[PDB]
Design a protein around this ligand. Structure first.
Ligand SMILES: *[C@@H]1O[C@H](CO)[C@@H](O)[C@H](O)[C@H]1NC(C)=O
Length: 332
């Protein structure tokens, strides 16, 4: 049913360079991209940073792994953070060297996006999806695009979108706007309504609405709330929808927040991951134009808790072997 069955495998080269040797469920060594493909994955998400000091996740880093994904028959979803480091609702740090005034920043954002798009094209990489920003619920490129400067945000997003549209990418990618807390209809509605009413960024400027959906940052993240929120988003703007980030723990000794009521019966184990992922996938599929699901960093074994309060959210053993839960992508 789902058009996109994927995972964010951004850390792949970082882990291989750290000595990780990935193995299939049979226990035999095999390139990660091939393991993913063999398990049903058809798309990989990758975070792109502007000028990270150590080079990890910069454009060259992404082109190299995108080529590998392409060779494994996997489509590529480019996630522009528009920052030199992690971009999230609490951090949208201006890339070093970029101007702060809206006129010039908008132009810089356009140039950067256009440039990156053309470089991807020249490398033979045509991403199927491109998000202009990562979880920009509180805006982007702070403080210039910090909420509530809806006028600046809409303008910046318009420039980013057209940087892609004016590029040489062929075929062109679907343009996505990504917000966190997919279950929170109030915030989704508040954000899109205020951004779209500015008159610069138009509905026709983008194609997809992506949301993050995690069970360990609030008990309000129920499957029912996700369903209702996505249904509302679909009926209001009728754009393709996708859960672009999600996790389920195989181990969670002491959570910082209570888990959502409709998932408390799901065990912390590979079997549990299979159940949770399949259920989230089917919630998306039950939504008008719900087309994708992406698990976040299933193979980052050296960062098992993946920034959450739960101990282990990966889908691979500490020795680098794919767990039984990875084949879930063959059934959604
Ligand atoms: C954007 O690129 C154009 C053409 O290369 C250049 O003239 C302009 O100065 C750039 N804008 C910014 C703010 O970098």
């Amino acid at each position: 049913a789902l058009t996109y069955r994927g995972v964010d495998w951004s850390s792949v080269v970082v882990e291989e360079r750290a000595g990780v040797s990935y193995k299939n469920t049979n226990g035999n060594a095999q390139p990660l991209e091939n393991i993913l493909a063999a398990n049903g994955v058809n798309t990989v998400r990758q975070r792109v940073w502007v000028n990270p000091a150590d080079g990890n996740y910069n454009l060259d880093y992404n082109i190299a792994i995108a080529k590998r994904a392409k060779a494994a028959g996997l489509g590529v979803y480019i996630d522009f953070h528009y920052s030199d480091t992690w971009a999230d609702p609490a951090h949208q740090t201006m890339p070093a060297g970029w101007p702060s005034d809206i006129d010039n920043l908008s132009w810089k954002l356009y140039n950067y996006t256009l440039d990156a798009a053309n470089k991807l094209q020249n490398a033979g990489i045509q991403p199927t999806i491109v998000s202009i920003g990562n979880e920009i619920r509180a805006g982007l490129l702070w403080p210039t695009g910090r909420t509530e400067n809806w006028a600046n945000i809409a303008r910046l997003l318009h420039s980013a979108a057209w940087g892609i549209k004016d590029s040489s990418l062929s075929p062109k990618p679907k343009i996505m706007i990504h917000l966190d807390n997919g279950w929170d209809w109030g915030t989704q509605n508040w954000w899109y309504t205020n951004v779209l009413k500015q008159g610069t960024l138009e509905l026709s400027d983008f194609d997809m609405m992506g949301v993050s959906f995690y069970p360990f940052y609030s008990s309000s993240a129920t499957l029912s709330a996700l369903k209702s929120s996505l249904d509302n988003m679909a009926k209001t703007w009728n754009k393709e929808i996708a859960v672009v980030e999600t996790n389920w723990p195989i181990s969670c000794p002491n959570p910082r927040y209570s888990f959502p009521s409709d998932v408390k019966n799901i065990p912390f184990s590979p079997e549990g991951q299979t159940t949770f992922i399949t259920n989230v996938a089917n919630i998306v599929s039950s939504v008008s134009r719900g087309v994708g699901l992406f698990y976040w960093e299933p193979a980052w074994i050296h960062n098992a808790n993946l920034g959450s309060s739960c101990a282990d959210n990966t889908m691979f053993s500490q020795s680098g072997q794919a767990l039984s839960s990875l084949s879930v992508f063959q059934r959604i």
